[PDB]
Structures are given as structure tokens and as C-alpha cells.
Amino acid sequence: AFVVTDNCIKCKYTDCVEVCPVDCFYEGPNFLVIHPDECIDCALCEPECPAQAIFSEDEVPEDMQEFIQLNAELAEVWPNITEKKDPLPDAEDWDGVKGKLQHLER
Ligand code: SF4
Ligand code: F3S
């Protein structure tokens, strides 16, 4: 599985879904996650994310390890997203801001 980490939050560019061959992205109000059972680890989305939020599970930074389970959990309850949309309005402002997990919306 690949995993969406902190920097997506309040950015949510949704560039990543456009290259996903298996459509395993699931949508929250201000964040996307990858369904780990669905992901085929093609790695195609990693270079697509402007926020550079996506990692191979085995390359998730130690300080963002919580994101792994969080992706798996939210992927069970959020709706599939398979089409790019406008990035969130103040995305440029939040890109690069750390600890955005405190802003995650269910
Ligand atoms: S690694 Fe491939 S299959 Fe998994 S989320 Fe990214 S694009 Fe989709
Ligand atoms: S900001 Fe999030 S919505 Fe996709 S293109 Fe990056 S993981």
C-alpha cells in the first residue's frame, strides 16, 4: 500500500486520483486516503502529489506513522473519489505547514 500523510490536509489537490489505475482513493472534506487492500502499489501517484504527501507504506516518516492505520480506517467509511477536482481554496497557504493532523475533518 501507499499512504497519504499530513501535508494533504487542507491542500487536497486530488492530482493523485487521476493516475490511479484501481481507483483506491477515498474522500474526506479536507483530506484523501488510500485503501490499503485495493492499492496495487504501482507507485504512480507518489510523483503526482504537489504536496508530496504520498509515501510507500514502508517509507512513511517515523513522525507520520499514524497515517498508515488512519488511511486504512478512513478508507472504510469515506466515499470513493475517482476524478480530479479543484484544490481546496487556500491550499497554497497550507502546503508545507506541519502538524495539520489537528485540522483533519471527518
Ligand atoms: S500506488 Fe497505484 S494503486 Fe496505489 S493509490 Fe497510488 S496510484 Fe493507486
Ligand atoms: S494533496 Fe492529497 S488529494 Fe492527492 S494530489 Fe496530494 S494526496
From Swiss-Prot:
Cofactor binding mode and count: Binds 1 [4Fe-4S] cluster.
Binding positions ([3Fe-4S] cluster): C8, C16, C49
Organism taxonomic ancestry: Bacteria, Pseudomonadati, Pseudomonadota, Gammaproteobacteria, Pseudomonadales
Domain of life: Bacteria
Region (Disordered): 83-106
Name of the protein described by the UniProt record: Ferredoxin-1
Any GO MF annotation of the entry: 3 iron, 4 sulfur cluster binding
Domain 4Fe-4S ferredoxin-type residue range list: 1-29, 30-59
Role noted for this protein: Ferredoxins are iron-sulfur proteins that transfer electrons in a wide variety of metabolic reactions. This ferredoxin could play a role in regulating gene expression by interacting directly with DNA.
Essential cofactor(s): [4Fe-4S] cluster; [3Fe-4S] cluster
Annotated Basic and acidic residues bias: 95-106
Matching NCBIfam families: FdxA_Protbact
Ranges in a coiled coil: none
Alphabetical keyword list: 3Fe-4S, 4Fe-4S, DNA-binding, Electron transport, Iron, Iron-sulfur, Metal-binding, Repeat, Transport
InterPro entries, per database record: 4Fe4S_Fe-S-bd, 4Fe4S_Fe_S_CS, 7Fe_ferredoxin, Fd_C, FdxA, RnfB_subfamily
Amino-acid positions noted as binding [4Fe-4S] cluster in the UniProt annotation, renumbered to this chain: C20, C39, C42, C45
